[PDB]
Amino acid sequence: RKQVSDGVAHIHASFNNTIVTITDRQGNALGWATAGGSGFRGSRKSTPFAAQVAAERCADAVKEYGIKNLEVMVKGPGPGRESTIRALNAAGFRITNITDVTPIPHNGCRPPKKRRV
Amino acid sequence: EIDYKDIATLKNYITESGKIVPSRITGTRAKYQRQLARAIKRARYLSLLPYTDRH
Amino acid sequence: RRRVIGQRKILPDPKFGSELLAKFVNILMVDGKKSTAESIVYSALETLAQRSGKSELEAFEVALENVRPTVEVKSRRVGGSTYQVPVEVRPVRRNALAMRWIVEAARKRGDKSMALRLANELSDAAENKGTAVKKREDVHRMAEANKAFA
Amino acid sequence: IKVRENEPFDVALRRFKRSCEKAGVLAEVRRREFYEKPTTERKRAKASAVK
RNA sequence: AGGCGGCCCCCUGGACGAAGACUGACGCUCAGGUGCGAAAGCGUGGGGAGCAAACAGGAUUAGAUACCCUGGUAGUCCACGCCGUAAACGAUGUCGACUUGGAGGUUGUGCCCUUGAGGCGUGGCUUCCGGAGCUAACGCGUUAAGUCGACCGCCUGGGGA
């Protein structure tokens, strides 16, 4: 459509996959990518590593909107919730602020099944 | 002063995550901490606080 | 469970004091005979000087550097089924593998005179085609996929 | 959860992990424990001066 | 007892206190009786977002009418009744009095500049350790499995039941 030079980057992390979607203030997506859709399967799809590729695949789909400065919003408990922030900061962007919608730690879920020392 | 229904008093007993603080900084002499921790939850229903910071 | 054993420096060459050449004869040694390597040593560099050999300051040390191993792996485990991981090799290993890669690439098909089969490979060691390069890229296409969960 | 702090870079150092509470170095847990030790060692015994 | 939980205003049994007053053994337990439900189920109609026996499919395996994954009915909820069973567990039947200790709470009431992060008394509760006592040994320990008494039920090797 027409460039806007401002928006929000939403990182939504599940125990199997990670979604990276950039939105405008009118309440819609500009660009989306996922850790699975970045060519990852099984125990690789559920990594913080596959989420770092999703930032550069979202950067390839938001190209039309003229955005260089954006703020971050983190969602979900999954393993991709931290690793991809600094990778998006390396994809041709500047991060103005960081926020999250994390509950306080009482829900538990997914013991690590890996090392750990 | 001396009551929980004033936000400039109330904000001294809670965090930037909506949580209640330890007794060591409430001035309750460790004897009214139980009642103050309930008065802070009562402030949510008096339109002074949101029910959780994440919403 | 810790090997790491001793310390072994080996001897240099008797004619110029070379450390690389005195090691390269230990790759061409077969049946415990070093004489067969001394028929290939200097003669490959002098046969390169019949086709393309320009400058000899390092002899063949830069052909062994244009030959570039990168796709070495190890196996990681916590029980039965294992997980492959790539490894960043030391220059002493990178050199030891490059010395086999080129003499095994020169042995790939049967022909006359190993000094001449190696000179044909050293004339290629300025552009590196087919042998010692086409298998590398076909396994390097997993080199980051085998880092994902460490 | 905090950690909203705007560093564009991953740091090559430990700053908040494995050294303060819930193990290691402080508040150690499991990895073999001893139960006669608290009913054996009560007062020093050494440190004045070994040298 | 089972268990009880967002807040706000109600309806309401019990318990605890201080000064007085009025009773004058009114104290304990109880054969057979007479009564409480966590969850799931039923009797009758409503209500139906999660979720979920069954149902309906997929995967796995040589097989899988199971695990696991994807959909999903009864049910969960409300009224008027039924079911009366549980780790109902603190594996500790029920009434009182008697008893060297340590450490931490909950709530009345008396006297004090509370000139004390309250203090010293006096009442009712309540938690983690620990010594005398108990005991096959584990476990109990002033809220005892201790100590001295009152009362009601059951057991006598297990399989078979």
From Swiss-Prot, chain A:
| Keywords from the named record | Methylation, Ribonucleoprotein, Ribosomal protein, RNA-binding, rRNA-binding
Q: Which GO terms describe its cellular component?
A: cytoplasm; cytosol; cytosolic small ribosomal subunit
- GO terms, biological process: cytoplasmic translation; translation
> Which family is annotated?
Belongs to the universal ribosomal protein uS11 family.
Q: How far does the signal peptide extend, from start to end residue?
A: none
Tell me what else is known.
Has been predicted to contact the N-terminal domain of IF-3 based on footprint studies; exactly how IF-3 interacts with the 30S subunit is controversial.
Task: Name the chain's protein.
Answer: Small ribosomal subunit protein uS11
The annotated subunit structure for this chain is: Part of the 30S ribosomal subunit. Interacts with proteins uS7 and bS18. Cross-links to IF-3. In stalled ribosomes contacts ribosome rescue factor SmrB.
Gene Ontology molecular function:
small ribosomal subunit rRNA binding; structural constituent of ribosome
Q: What does this protein do?
A: Located on the platform of the 30S subunit, it bridges several disparate RNA helices of the 16S rRNA. Forms part of the Shine-Dalgarno cleft in the 70S ribosome.
From Swiss-Prot, chain B:
Is-annotated flag, keyword Cell membrane? no
Lineage top rank: taxon: Bacteria
An annotated GO BP: translation
Key words of the record: Acetylation, Ribonucleoprotein, Ribosomal protein, RNA-binding, rRNA-binding
Q: Does the keyword Acetylation apply?
A: yes
Q: Which GO terms describe its molecular function?
A: mRNA 5'-UTR binding; small ribosomal subunit rRNA binding; structural constituent of ribosome
GO cellular component assignments: cytoplasm; cytosol; cytosolic small ribosomal subunit
Name the family. Answer: Belongs to the bacterial ribosomal protein bS18 family.
Q: Please give the function described in this protein's UniProt entry.
A: Binds as a heterodimer with protein bS6 to the central domain of the 16S rRNA, where it helps stabilize the platform of the 30S subunit.
Give the quaternary structure: Part of the 30S ribosomal subunit. Forms a tight heterodimer with protein bS6.
Q: What is this protein called?
A: Small ribosomal subunit protein bS18
Swiss-Prot record, chain C:
Look up the domain of life of the source.
Bacteria
Question: Cystine bridges: which residues?
Answer: none
Q: Which GO terms describe its biological process?
A: cytoplasmic translation; negative regulation of translation; ribosomal small subunit assembly; translation
* Keyword Nucleotide-binding annotated: no
Q: What UniProt keywords apply to this chain's record, in alphabetical order?
A: Ribonucleoprotein, Ribosomal protein, RNA-binding, rRNA-binding, tRNA-binding
Q: Which GO terms describe its molecular function?
A: mRNA binding; rRNA binding; structural constituent of ribosome; tRNA binding
| Cellular component, GO, one term | cytosol
Which family would the database say this protein is a member of?
Belongs to the universal ribosomal protein uS7 family.
Instruction: Report the protein's function.
Output: One of the primary rRNA binding proteins, it binds directly to 16S rRNA where it nucleates assembly of the head domain of the 30S subunit. Is located at the subunit interface close to the decoding center, where it has been shown to contact mRNA. Has been shown to contact tRNA in both the P and E sites; it probably blocks exit of the E site tRNA. Protein S7 is also a translational repressor protein; it regulates the expression of the str operon members to different degrees by binding to its mRNA.
| Record's subunit section | Part of the 30S ribosomal subunit. Contacts proteins S9 and S11. Cross-links to IF3 and the P and E site tRNAs.
Q: What else is known?
A: The strain K12 sequence is shown. Has been predicted to contact the N-terminal domain of IF-3 based on footprint studies; exactly how IF-3 interacts with the 30S subunit is controversial.
* Annotated protein name in UniProt: Small ribosomal subunit protein uS7
Tell me the name of the encoding gene: rpsG
Residue span relative to the full protein? 3 to 152 of 179
Curated annotation (Swiss-Prot), chain D:
Q: One Gene Ontology cellular component annotation?
A: cytosol
Keywords, in A-Z order: Ribonucleoprotein, Ribosomal protein, RNA-binding, rRNA-binding
In the record, biological process GO terms are: cytoplasmic translation; ribosomal small subunit assembly
- UniProt entry tagged with the keyword Hydrolase: no
UniProt GO molecular function: rRNA binding; structural constituent of ribosome
Q: List compositional bias (Basic residues) regions by residue number.
A: 43-51
* Role played: Probbly involved in recognition of ribosome rescue factor SmrB in stalled/collided disomes; fusion of protein fragments to its N-terminus decreases ribosome rescue in the presence of SmrB.
Q: How does it assemble?
A: Part of the 30S ribosomal subunit. In stalled ribosomes contacts ribosome rescue factor SmrB.
Family to which the UniProt record says this protein belongs: Belongs to the bacterial ribosomal protein bS21 family.
Instruction: Please give the name of this protein.
Output: Small ribosomal subunit protein bS21
Please report the organism this UniProt entry assigns to the protein. Answer: Escherichia coli (strain K12)
Q: Which residues of the full protein are shown?
A: 4 to 54 of 71
